[PDB]
Design a protein around this ligand. Structure first.
Ligand SMILES: [Zn+2]
Length: 257
């Protein structure tokens, strides 16, 4: 199947998912000097007060914290977006070492990890129909660097022992995703795709400029997860990131001067 190893990783994905070589693939390098400030962007609105987390799941590629998206409980609006996008899950990509792990890069800089908060456009009714649309999804991306601990991350780190292997899940109610956000909502935005198979070109990317800091100990617990299932040979879940893809005919916009 697909994965991140030598034999089924990003260089091989195109054989089953030919859109991998398409015109609006993600991630990309964000060249900060070439991004254009757009005064037309409206402020970003992150409204997570009534988010309802439900469960955390190791899917063999990352872990997802899942939300109740049957009502507008946690939504993203404004910025480059038309309409309302509802939070359905978040997950991370991370490295085997602190010098790598992010999917997007900033002037070729790789961060230790990258958080993706995934939202679908409520005009399409549910996630599955949204990923048949060029404006179906909005993913809020946040970089992680290693430094001081992020207190709002610690409940996630502490449940990882219960979902070590592919297919395990655990209750994960009453988690507040606002505790994963940096102070500033300054961002870059561009049209792109899912960064894993099926690599569908449905995503408005919104990448925050300000990273959050997490401790060495917190990201080390990410690296103890497993890609394999229970009872199978252990393969640590590390380096589950896709490298930067060609920008092609795209412009990255900045919300800030
Ligand atoms: Zn992701």
């Amino acid at each position: 199947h697909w994965g991140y190893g030598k034999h089924n990783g990003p260089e091989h994905w195109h054989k089953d998912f030919p859109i991998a070589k398409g015109e609006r693939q993600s991630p990309v390098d964000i060249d900060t000097h070439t991004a254009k400030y757009d005064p037309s962007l409206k402020p970003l609105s992150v409204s997570y007060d009534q988010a309802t987390s439900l469960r955390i799941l190791n899917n063999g590629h990352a872990f997802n914290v899942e939300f109740d998206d049957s009502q507008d409980k946690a939504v993203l609006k404004g910025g480059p977006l038309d309409g309302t996008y509802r939070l359905i899950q978040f997950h991370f990509h991370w490295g085997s070492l602190d010098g790598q792990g992010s999917e997007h890069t900033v002037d070729k800089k790789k961060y230790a990890a990258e958080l993706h908060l995934v939202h679908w456009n409520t005009k399409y009714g549910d996630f599955g129909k949204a990923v048949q649309q060029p404006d179906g999804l909005a993913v809020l991306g946040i970089f992680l660097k290693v430094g001081s601990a992020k207190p709002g991350l610690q409940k996630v780190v502490d449940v990882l022992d219960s979902i070590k292997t592919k297919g395990k899940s655990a209750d994960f109610t009453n988690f507040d995703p606002r505790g994963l956000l940096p102070e500033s909502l300054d961002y870059w935005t561009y049209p792109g795709s899912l960064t894993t198979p099926p690599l569908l070109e449905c995503v408005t990317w919104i990448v925050l400029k300000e990273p959050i800091s997490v401790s060495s100990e917190q990201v080390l617990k990410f690296r103890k997860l497993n890609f394999n299932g229970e009872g199978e040979p252990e393969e640590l879940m590390v380096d589950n990131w896709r490298p930067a893809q060609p920008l092609k005919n795209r412009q990255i916009k900045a919300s800030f001067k």
